[PDB]
Design a protein around this ligand. Structure first.
Ligand code: 09L
Length: 340
């Protein structure tokens, strides 16, 4: 019988939930009979990202309708679906890139799982992350809760958020890998929301950069690690419904350095000299006059006020780093979503 405290055991259950893995696949219209959870592989996915990279290049550089259709036919061969939309544009590509991002982390969670002691303690060790419950009445839980209420956007009014549990986390080797940037200026505690089915992958391997095979054109600001300073922007990425109105969000200390400010899409491979991050400018920004500090990290917990900028693609800000060593995962929050 496991010694871990109940909110932790309950977190481990959610993360390694094989049912939620299948649900998330069927939501991306995958053919479970032609390709179930067990038949999913890292290199199949990586090859499917490569076909998408080839699709985007064929659309860009003038290629025959016959060519793109063959590249498309191969994607659907490699990843069987059951609905066959032609992958001939940036939109069709982004939708498949978003699905593979989920498949890659689902296959990570199923590889660990299917690879003496209580099975919960075993699965917790495969995470290679120390997890502690943060006491509700601490300074840490004071700051983390205010950040939530304030930075929830007015337009994402469809639900209200309620904090269930706050976990302090520590990935093995992350502080040592972080050491080079531990010095950098502009250090912000930012939100990163993802489906619960991706958390085994995020804790075991940390937040990564998409595989080399993934098209840089498949992400608005290219192949980086993305954060928001507005809780609801990241909480929307939890994709909580009603069969599961409980999602997980991360808080990571991010080494922003010099921010390359952008208003629109920029499919960036590497940053220009003199820059360490990208800041996508939102129409609404959390007030810089209500900012606070926590353990050497700046917290933009200010309320949502106009940034001035109007000619932008983004309603709200977002932050991108292009080195995995620029992020320090600090907290995992378990949230309750209350829909209208
Ligand atoms: O950080 C993102 C990412 C997330 C999103 C959606 C998103 N998800 N979550 C957020 O909190 C967020 C905040 C601001 C802007 C977007 C987001 C979009 C493009 C991205 F490149 N990654 C997706 C691609 N990466 C992978 O490891 C994929 C799984 C193989 C690197 C991590």
């Amino acid at each position: 019988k496991s010694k871990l405290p109940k909110p932790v055991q309950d977190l481990i259950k959610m993360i390694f939930d094989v049912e939620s893995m299948k649900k998330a696949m069927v939501e991306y219209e995958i053919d479970l009979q032609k390709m179930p959870l067990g038949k999913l592989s890292k290199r199949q996915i990586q090859a499917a990202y490569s076909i998408l990279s080839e699709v985007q290049q064929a659309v860009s550089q003038g290629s025959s309708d016959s060519q793109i259709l063959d590249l498309s036919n191969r994607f659907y061969t490699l990843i069987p679906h059951d609905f066959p939309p032609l992958l001939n544009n940036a939109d069709s590509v982004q939708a498949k890139v978003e699905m593979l991002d989920n498949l890659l982390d689902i296959e990570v969670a199923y590889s660990l799982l299917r690879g003496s002691k209580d099975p919960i303690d075993v699965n917790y060790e495969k995470l290679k992350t120390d997890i502690k419950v943060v006491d509700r009445d601490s300074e840490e839980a004071e700051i983390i809760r205010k950040y939530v209420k304030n930075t929830h956007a007015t337009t994402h009014n469809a639900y209200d958020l309620e904090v269930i549990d706050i976990f302090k986390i520590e990935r093995e080797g992350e502080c040592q890998r972080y050491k080079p940037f531990k010095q950098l200026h502009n250090r912000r505690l930012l939100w990163h929301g993802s489906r619960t089915t991706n958390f085994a992958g995020i804790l075991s391997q940390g937040l990564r950069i998409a595989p080399p095979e993934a098209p840089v054109t498949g992400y608005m600001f290219g192949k980086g690690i993305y954060f928001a300073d507005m809780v609801s922007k990241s909480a929307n990425y939890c994709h909580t419904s009603q069969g599961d109105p409980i999602g997980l969000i991360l808080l990571g200390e991010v080494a922003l350095g010099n921010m390359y400010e952008l208003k629109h899409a920029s499919h960036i491979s590497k940053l220009p000299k003199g820059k360490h991050s990208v800041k996508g400018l939102g129409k609404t920004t959390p007030d810089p006059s209500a900012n606070i500090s926590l353990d050497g990290v700046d917290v933009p917990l200010g309320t949502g006020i106009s940034s001035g900028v109007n000619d932008t693609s983004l309603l709200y800000n977002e932050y991108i780093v292009y080195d995995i060593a620029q992020v320090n995962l600090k907290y995992l929050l378990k949230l309750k979503f209350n829909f209208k």
